[PDB]
Coordinates of C-alpha atoms in Angstrom, one line a residue:
Chain C
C1 CA 120.1 89.8 109.7
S2 CA 117.8 88.5 106.8
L3 CA 114.2 87.4 107.2
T4 CA 114.4 84.6 104.7
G5 CA 114.2 81.2 106.4
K6 CA 112.1 79.3 109.0
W7 CA 111.2 80.8 112.4
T8 CA 109.4 79.9 115.6
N9 CA 108.1 82.3 118.2
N10 CA 107.5 82.2 122.0
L11 CA 103.9 80.9 121.5
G12 CA 105.1 77.9 119.3
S13 CA 103.9 79.4 116.0
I14 CA 106.1 78.8 113.0
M15 CA 106.6 80.8 109.8
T16 CA 108.6 80.4 106.6
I17 CA 109.8 83.5 104.7
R18 CA 110.9 83.2 101.1
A19 CA 113.5 85.2 99.3
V20 CA 113.6 88.9 99.9
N21 CA 113.7 90.9 96.7
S22 CA 115.7 94.1 95.9
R23 CA 112.9 96.2 97.2
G24 CA 112.8 94.3 100.5
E25 CA 109.6 92.6 99.7
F26 CA 108.8 89.0 100.9
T27 CA 106.1 86.4 101.0
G28 CA 105.7 83.4 103.3
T29 CA 103.5 81.1 105.2
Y30 CA 102.4 81.3 108.8
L31 CA 101.2 78.5 111.1
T32 CA 99.8 79.9 114.3
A33 CA 99.8 77.8 117.4
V34 CA 97.0 79.9 118.8
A35 CA 93.5 81.0 117.8
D36 CA 89.9 81.4 119.1
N37 CA 89.0 78.0 117.7
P38 CA 92.4 76.1 117.3
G39 CA 90.7 73.1 115.7
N40 CA 90.1 75.4 112.7
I41 CA 93.7 76.6 112.1
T42 CA 95.1 76.4 108.6
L43 CA 98.2 77.7 106.9
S44 CA 98.0 81.4 106.1
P45 CA 99.9 83.6 103.7
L46 CA 102.1 86.6 104.8
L47 CA 103.3 89.5 102.7
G48 CA 105.7 92.2 103.9
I49 CA 108.7 94.5 103.5
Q50 CA 112.0 94.9 105.2
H51 CA 114.7 97.5 104.9
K52 CA 117.5 96.2 102.7
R53 CA 120.7 98.1 103.6
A54 CA 120.5 97.9 107.4
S55 CA 122.4 95.1 109.1
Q56 CA 119.6 95.0 111.7
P57 CA 116.6 95.9 109.6
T58 CA 113.1 96.9 110.7
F59 CA 110.3 95.2 108.8
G60 CA 106.6 94.7 108.7
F61 CA 104.2 92.0 107.4
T62 CA 100.6 91.2 107.1
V63 CA 99.1 87.7 107.8
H64 CA 95.8 87.0 106.0
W65 CA 94.2 84.3 108.2
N66 CA 92.8 81.7 105.9
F67 CA 90.4 80.3 108.5
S68 CA 88.8 83.5 109.9
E69 CA 87.9 87.0 108.8
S70 CA 90.7 88.6 110.8
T71 CA 94.1 90.0 109.8
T72 CA 97.3 90.4 111.9
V73 CA 100.2 92.8 111.2
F74 CA 103.6 92.3 112.8
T75 CA 106.4 94.9 112.9
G76 CA 109.8 94.7 114.5
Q77 CA 113.5 94.5 114.1
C78 CA 116.0 91.7 113.4
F79 CA 118.9 91.7 115.9
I80 CA 122.2 89.8 115.7
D81 CA 124.1 89.1 118.9
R82 CA 127.9 88.6 119.1
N83 CA 127.6 84.9 118.3
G84 CA 125.7 85.5 115.0
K85 CA 122.3 84.4 116.6
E86 CA 119.3 86.3 115.2
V87 CA 116.1 87.2 117.0
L88 CA 113.1 89.1 115.6
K89 CA 111.6 91.4 118.3
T90 CA 108.0 92.2 117.2
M91 CA 104.8 93.7 118.2
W92 CA 101.5 92.9 116.5
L93 CA 97.9 94.0 116.1
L94 CA 95.2 91.5 115.4
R95 CA 92.1 93.0 113.7
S96 CA 88.8 91.1 114.0
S97 CA 85.8 91.7 111.7
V98 CA 83.0 93.5 113.5
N99 CA 79.5 94.2 112.1
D100 CA 79.7 98.0 111.8
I101 CA 81.6 101.0 112.8
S102 CA 79.9 101.3 116.3
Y103 CA 81.8 98.1 117.3
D104 CA 85.2 99.2 116.1
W105 CA 86.4 99.9 119.6
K106 CA 86.6 96.2 120.4
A107 CA 88.2 95.0 117.2
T108 CA 92.0 95.3 117.7
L109 CA 94.1 93.1 120.0
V110 CA 97.8 93.9 120.7
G111 CA 100.7 91.8 121.7
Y112 CA 104.3 90.8 121.2
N113 CA 106.3 87.9 119.8
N114 CA 109.9 87.0 119.9
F115 CA 111.0 84.8 116.9
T116 CA 114.1 82.7 116.7
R117 CA 115.4 80.7 113.7
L118 CA 114.5 77.0 113.5
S119 CA 117.9 75.1 113.6
Chain F
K1 CA 81.4 95.6 98.7
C2 CA 84.7 97.5 99.8
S3 CA 87.9 97.4 97.7
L4 CA 90.9 99.3 99.0
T5 CA 91.8 100.3 95.4
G6 CA 91.8 104.1 95.0
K7 CA 93.1 107.2 96.8
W8 CA 92.4 107.9 100.4
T9 CA 93.2 110.7 102.9
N10 CA 93.3 110.3 106.7
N11 CA 92.7 112.5 109.7
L12 CA 96.3 113.8 109.8
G13 CA 96.1 114.8 106.1
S14 CA 98.2 111.9 104.7
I15 CA 97.4 110.4 101.3
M16 CA 97.7 106.9 100.1
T17 CA 97.0 105.4 96.7
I18 CA 96.2 101.7 96.5
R19 CA 96.5 99.9 93.1
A20 CA 94.4 96.8 91.9
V21 CA 93.6 94.2 94.5
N22 CA 94.4 90.7 93.2
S23 CA 92.4 87.6 93.6
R24 CA 94.3 86.7 96.8
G25 CA 93.5 90.2 98.2
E26 CA 97.1 91.4 97.8
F27 CA 97.7 95.1 96.9
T28 CA 100.5 97.5 96.5
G29 CA 100.5 101.3 96.6
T30 CA 102.1 104.5 97.8
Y31 CA 101.8 106.5 101.0
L32 CA 102.6 110.2 101.4
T33 CA 102.7 110.9 105.1
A34 CA 101.8 114.3 106.4
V35 CA 103.9 113.7 109.5
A36 CA 107.4 112.6 110.4
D37 CA 110.3 113.6 112.8
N38 CA 111.6 115.9 110.0
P39 CA 108.8 116.7 107.6
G40 CA 111.3 118.3 105.2
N41 CA 112.8 114.8 104.5
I42 CA 109.4 113.1 103.8
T43 CA 109.3 111.2 100.4
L44 CA 106.6 109.1 98.8
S45 CA 106.9 105.6 100.2
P46 CA 105.7 102.1 99.0
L47 CA 103.1 100.0 100.7
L48 CA 102.2 96.3 100.4
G49 CA 99.3 94.5 102.0
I50 CA 96.5 92.0 102.0
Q51 CA 92.7 92.4 102.4
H52 CA 90.0 89.8 102.7
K53 CA 88.2 89.2 99.4
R54 CA 84.8 87.7 100.1
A55 CA 83.7 90.0 102.8
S56 CA 81.7 93.1 102.0
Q57 CA 83.4 94.9 104.9
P58 CA 86.9 93.3 104.8
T59 CA 89.6 93.5 107.3
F60 CA 93.1 94.2 105.9
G61 CA 96.7 95.0 106.8
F62 CA 99.6 96.7 105.1
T63 CA 103.2 97.6 105.6
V64 CA 104.7 101.0 104.7
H65 CA 108.5 100.9 104.0
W66 CA 109.4 104.6 104.7
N67 CA 111.9 105.6 101.9
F68 CA 113.4 108.4 104.0
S69 CA 114.1 106.6 107.3
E70 CA 115.0 103.3 108.8
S71 CA 111.5 102.9 110.2
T72 CA 108.5 100.7 109.2
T73 CA 104.8 101.2 109.9
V74 CA 102.1 98.6 109.8
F75 CA 98.4 99.4 109.6
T76 CA 95.4 97.1 110.2
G77 CA 91.7 97.7 110.1
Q78 CA 88.4 97.3 108.5
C79 CA 86.6 98.9 105.6
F80 CA 83.0 99.9 106.5
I81 CA 80.2 100.9 104.1
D82 CA 77.5 103.0 105.7
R83 CA 73.8 103.0 104.8
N84 CA 74.5 105.8 102.2
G85 CA 77.4 103.8 100.6
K86 CA 80.2 105.9 102.1
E87 CA 83.4 104.0 102.9
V88 CA 85.6 104.6 105.9
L89 CA 88.8 102.7 106.8
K90 CA 89.2 102.4 110.6
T91 CA 92.8 101.6 111.4
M92 CA 95.3 101.1 114.1
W93 CA 99.0 101.2 113.5
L94 CA 102.4 100.4 114.9
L95 CA 105.5 102.5 113.9
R96 CA 108.7 100.6 114.4
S97 CA 111.9 102.7 114.7
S98 CA 115.4 101.3 114.3
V99 CA 117.4 101.1 117.5
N100 CA 121.1 100.3 117.8
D101 CA 120.8 97.0 119.7
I102 CA 118.3 94.9 121.6
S103 CA 118.8 96.7 124.9
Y104 CA 116.9 99.6 123.3
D105 CA 114.1 97.5 121.9
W106 CA 111.6 98.6 124.6
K107 CA 111.4 102.1 123.2
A108 CA 111.1 101.3 119.5
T109 CA 107.3 100.9 118.8
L110 CA 104.8 103.7 118.7
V111 CA 101.1 103.0 118.5
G112 CA 98.2 105.1 117.1
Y113 CA 95.1 105.2 115.0
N114 CA 94.0 106.7 111.6
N115 CA 90.6 107.0 110.0
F116 CA 90.6 107.2 106.1
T117 CA 88.1 108.3 103.6
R118 CA 88.2 108.4 99.8
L119 CA 89.7 111.2 97.8
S120 CA 86.7 111.7 95.6
Chain Y
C1 CA 97.5 85.9 143.2
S2 CA 97.9 89.3 145.2
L3 CA 99.9 92.3 143.9
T4 CA 101.4 93.2 147.2
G5 CA 105.1 92.6 147.4
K6 CA 108.3 93.1 145.5
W7 CA 108.6 92.4 141.8
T8 CA 111.1 92.4 138.9
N9 CA 110.5 92.4 135.2
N10 CA 112.2 91.1 132.1
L11 CA 114.0 94.5 131.6
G12 CA 115.5 94.4 135.2
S13 CA 113.1 97.0 136.6
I14 CA 111.8 96.6 140.1
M15 CA 108.6 97.7 141.9
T16 CA 107.2 97.4 145.4
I17 CA 103.4 97.3 145.8
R18 CA 101.9 98.1 149.2
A19 CA 98.8 96.6 150.8
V20 CA 95.7 96.3 148.6
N21 CA 92.6 97.8 150.2
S22 CA 89.0 96.4 150.1
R23 CA 88.4 98.2 146.8
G24 CA 91.4 96.7 145.2
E25 CA 93.4 100.0 145.3
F26 CA 97.1 100.0 145.8
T27 CA 100.1 102.3 145.8
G28 CA 103.8 101.6 145.3
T29 CA 107.2 102.6 144.0
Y30 CA 108.7 101.8 140.6
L31 CA 112.4 101.8 139.7
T32 CA 112.8 101.5 136.0
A33 CA 116.0 100.0 134.5
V34 CA 115.4 101.8 131.3
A35 CA 114.8 105.4 130.2
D36 CA 115.9 107.9 127.5
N37 CA 118.5 109.3 129.8
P38 CA 119.2 106.5 132.4
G39 CA 121.5 108.8 134.4
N40 CA 118.4 110.8 135.3
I41 CA 116.3 107.8 136.7
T42 CA 114.7 108.3 140.1
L43 CA 112.1 106.3 142.1
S44 CA 108.6 107.0 140.8
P45 CA 105.2 106.4 142.4
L46 CA 102.5 104.1 141.1
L47 CA 98.8 104.0 141.8
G48 CA 96.4 101.3 140.6
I49 CA 93.4 99.0 141.1
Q50 CA 93.1 95.2 140.9
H51 CA 90.0 93.0 141.1
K52 CA 89.6 91.6 144.6
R53 CA 87.5 88.4 144.3
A54 CA 89.3 86.8 141.4
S55 CA 92.0 84.2 142.1
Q56 CA 93.9 85.4 139.0
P57 CA 92.9 89.1 138.9
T58 CA 93.3 91.7 136.2
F59 CA 94.7 95.0 137.3
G60 CA 96.0 98.3 136.1
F61 CA 98.3 101.0 137.4
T62 CA 99.8 104.3 136.5
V63 CA 103.4 105.3 137.0
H64 CA 104.1 109.1 137.3
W65 CA 107.7 109.3 136.3
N66 CA 109.4 111.7 138.7
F67 CA 112.3 112.5 136.3
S68 CA 110.4 113.3 133.1
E69 CA 107.1 114.7 131.9
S70 CA 105.9 111.2 130.8
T71 CA 103.5 108.7 132.3
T72 CA 103.2 105.0 131.8
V73 CA 100.2 102.8 132.4
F74 CA 100.4 99.0 132.8
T75 CA 97.5 96.5 132.6
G76 CA 97.6 92.7 132.9
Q77 CA 96.7 89.7 134.9
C78 CA 98.3 87.8 137.8
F79 CA 98.6 84.1 137.0
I80 CA 99.4 81.2 139.5
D81 CA 101.0 78.0 138.1
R82 CA 100.6 74.6 139.7
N83 CA 103.6 75.2 142.0
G84 CA 102.2 78.4 143.5
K85 CA 104.5 80.6 141.3
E86 CA 103.1 84.0 140.3
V87 CA 103.7 86.0 137.1
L88 CA 102.2 89.3 136.1
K89 CA 101.7 89.3 132.3
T90 CA 101.3 93.0 131.3
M91 CA 101.2 95.4 128.4
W92 CA 102.0 99.0 128.8
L93 CA 101.6 102.4 127.1
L94 CA 104.2 105.1 127.7
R95 CA 102.9 108.6 127.0
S96 CA 105.4 111.4 126.3
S97 CA 104.7 115.1 126.5
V98 CA 104.5 116.8 123.1
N99 CA 104.1 120.5 122.4
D100 CA 100.7 120.5 120.9
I101 CA 98.0 118.4 119.5
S102 CA 99.6 118.2 116.0
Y103 CA 102.4 116.1 117.5
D104 CA 100.0 113.7 119.3
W105 CA 100.6 111.0 116.8
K106 CA 104.2 110.4 118.0
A107 CA 103.5 110.4 121.7
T108 CA 102.6 106.9 122.7
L109 CA 104.9 103.9 122.9
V110 CA 103.6 100.4 123.5
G111 CA 105.3 97.3 124.9
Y112 CA 105.1 94.3 127.3
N113 CA 106.5 93.3 130.6
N114 CA 106.5 90.0 132.5
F115 CA 107.0 90.4 136.2
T116 CA 108.1 87.8 138.8
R117 CA 108.3 88.0 142.5
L118 CA 111.6 88.9 144.1
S119 CA 112.5 85.9 146.3
Chain N
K1 CA 96.9 125.2 133.0
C2 CA 94.9 121.9 132.5
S3 CA 93.4 120.0 135.5
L4 CA 91.5 116.8 134.9
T5 CA 88.9 117.7 137.6
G6 CA 85.4 117.9 136.1
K7 CA 83.2 116.0 133.7
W8 CA 84.2 114.9 130.3
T9 CA 82.6 113.0 127.4
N10 CA 84.5 111.1 124.7
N11 CA 84.0 110.3 121.0
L12 CA 82.0 107.1 121.9
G13 CA 79.7 109.0 124.2
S14 CA 81.2 107.8 127.5
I15 CA 81.2 110.1 130.5
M16 CA 83.7 110.4 133.3
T17 CA 83.8 112.6 136.3
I18 CA 87.1 113.4 137.9
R19 CA 87.3 114.7 141.5
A20 CA 90.0 117.0 143.0
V21 CA 93.5 116.5 141.9
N22 CA 95.8 116.4 144.9
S23 CA 99.3 117.9 145.3
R24 CA 100.9 114.7 144.0
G25 CA 98.6 114.8 140.9
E26 CA 96.5 111.9 142.1
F27 CA 92.8 111.8 141.3
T28 CA 89.8 109.5 141.7
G29 CA 86.5 109.6 139.8
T30 CA 83.9 107.6 138.0
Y31 CA 83.5 106.4 134.5
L32 CA 80.2 105.5 132.7
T33 CA 81.1 103.7 129.5
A34 CA 78.8 103.9 126.5
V35 CA 80.2 100.5 125.2
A36 CA 80.7 97.0 126.5
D37 CA 80.1 93.4 125.4
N38 CA 76.7 93.5 127.0
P39 CA 75.6 97.1 127.4
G40 CA 72.6 96.1 129.5
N41 CA 75.1 95.1 132.3
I42 CA 77.1 98.4 132.3
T43 CA 77.3 100.1 135.7
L44 CA 79.2 103.2 136.9
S45 CA 82.8 102.2 137.6
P46 CA 85.6 103.8 139.7
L47 CA 88.8 105.2 138.3
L48 CA 92.1 106.1 139.9
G49 CA 95.0 107.9 138.3
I50 CA 97.9 110.4 138.3
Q51 CA 98.6 113.5 136.3
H52 CA 101.6 115.7 136.2
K53 CA 101.2 118.9 138.3
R54 CA 103.7 121.5 137.1
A55 CA 103.0 121.2 133.3
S56 CA 100.4 123.4 131.7
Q57 CA 99.6 120.5 129.3
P58 CA 100.2 117.5 131.6
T59 CA 100.4 113.9 130.7
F60 CA 98.4 111.5 132.9
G61 CA 97.2 108.0 133.3
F62 CA 94.3 106.3 135.0
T63 CA 92.9 102.8 135.7
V64 CA 89.2 101.9 135.4
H65 CA 88.1 98.9 137.5
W66 CA 84.9 97.8 135.6
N67 CA 82.3 97.0 138.3
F68 CA 80.4 94.7 136.0
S69 CA 83.1 92.5 134.6
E70 CA 86.5 91.0 135.4
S71 CA 88.3 93.4 133.0
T72 CA 90.4 96.5 133.6
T73 CA 91.1 99.4 131.3
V74 CA 94.0 101.8 131.5
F75 CA 94.1 105.2 129.7
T76 CA 97.1 107.4 129.1
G77 CA 97.4 110.7 127.4
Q78 CA 97.8 114.5 127.5
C79 CA 95.6 117.4 128.2
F80 CA 96.0 120.1 125.5
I81 CA 94.8 123.7 125.8
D82 CA 94.3 125.4 122.4
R83 CA 94.7 129.1 121.6
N84 CA 91.0 129.8 122.6
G85 CA 91.4 127.9 125.9
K86 CA 89.5 124.8 124.9
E87 CA 90.8 121.6 126.5
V88 CA 91.0 118.2 124.8
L89 CA 92.3 115.0 126.4
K90 CA 94.0 112.8 123.7
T91 CA 94.2 109.3 125.0
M92 CA 95.2 105.7 124.2
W93 CA 93.9 102.8 126.1
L94 CA 94.5 99.1 126.8
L95 CA 91.5 96.9 127.9
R96 CA 92.6 93.8 129.7
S97 CA 90.2 90.9 129.8
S98 CA 90.4 88.0 132.3
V99 CA 91.4 84.7 130.7
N100 CA 91.4 81.2 132.4
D101 CA 95.1 80.6 132.3
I102 CA 98.4 81.9 130.9
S103 CA 98.0 79.9 127.6
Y104 CA 95.2 82.4 126.6
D105 CA 97.2 85.5 127.6
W106 CA 97.9 86.4 124.0
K107 CA 94.3 87.3 123.3
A108 CA 93.6 89.3 126.4
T109 CA 94.5 92.9 125.6
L110 CA 92.5 95.3 123.3
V111 CA 94.0 98.6 122.2
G112 CA 92.3 101.8 121.2
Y113 CA 92.0 105.6 121.4
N114 CA 89.6 108.2 122.8
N115 CA 89.4 111.9 122.6
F116 CA 87.7 113.7 125.5
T117 CA 86.2 117.2 125.8
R118 CA 84.5 118.8 128.8
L119 CA 80.9 118.5 129.6
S120 CA 80.2 122.2 130.0

């Protein structure tokens, strides 16, 4: 299971991950299907690390949203079924920008996403 | 303005060191956790992340690839500057463990918080 | 959308929720399909509250696991599609018992579950 | 032994009052949050939960039905007793907002922590 390639998730978002280096580091581009103001969505860079030796590696990455002050992180594992089909099972945290520390409590959304490979 | 560059400790005693933040907001560093399932196996581990650049109190995220387990942690949060200029990173994290197959996926993700302040 | 009735989720767990009172309070019984030691699973009580007036209410409940020292909480919303079909979209936290406060960091798992009505 | 019965404050200044814990571990109470989207609309809200009974440091969960919004929060955690007999509730929470339809479900769930100690 390697992260390199093109992926879609259960919300219809897509991402492309470039080559994974010897340290497990990767870059890519994320197009979310969902946002607070969807008319404002632009492509956003991602940067992460996976484990290299594991056949079904865990990984994490950060998405710097280019159209808001927020940041999302994803972590999960790449699984391979008996037919060679890959799925990324992930959970995420979406951090919004708040004015000061007294508003921190309302700043972090949580959710899930399941990704499959595009063709 | 808040740059993540420098050394930080959190409420559990962990230390991380963040190198220069580039013009995209990308940064690398190391993380020495104070806690693990077997603290005797802990080793210094690499991190990689992105912060926002223009904001004075940026949000950010980073990934820690634990060098002593098959797990990965991601942190996200915001750097706040108080009226005296003191910086605090308020973060939440997800710690992903490796499981043997997808039937075990449900039990693989721990959640928590950490507050960081500067070492020095 | 009312919580009363019999439900299954995407992991194959089932639950039955009894009548919801005027305050939105409900009891029920939860059979998980998954656990650390699945051979030990027994039926476990749940207790929660939903909003009453809303057609698509938010709600929460606690499951006291009768076979371990852990507790799970679920929160989510009941949605009705155009055909009258209900789904509970939930997120959960599973709290394990740890020995003392220094282990608190490793005690809380997070996940999701989608529930649909049994027949 | 740790019973949730009594009054507690958390790190945000919120107060809750938990009534008698029954033989099943069930409890009701009230919660006065210090924080909300519009603090001027906050009202005292009911909670309902379950703790473990046999354990000296029980895990527990409860639901708060906010009486001034369409949201619901759930808390789960553990009551710890330290070597001097002081009790702390360590909790994590999920705050579910009401959204108009399932397409908005992704943005409906906030996560956080709270630490509680006794009022008195």
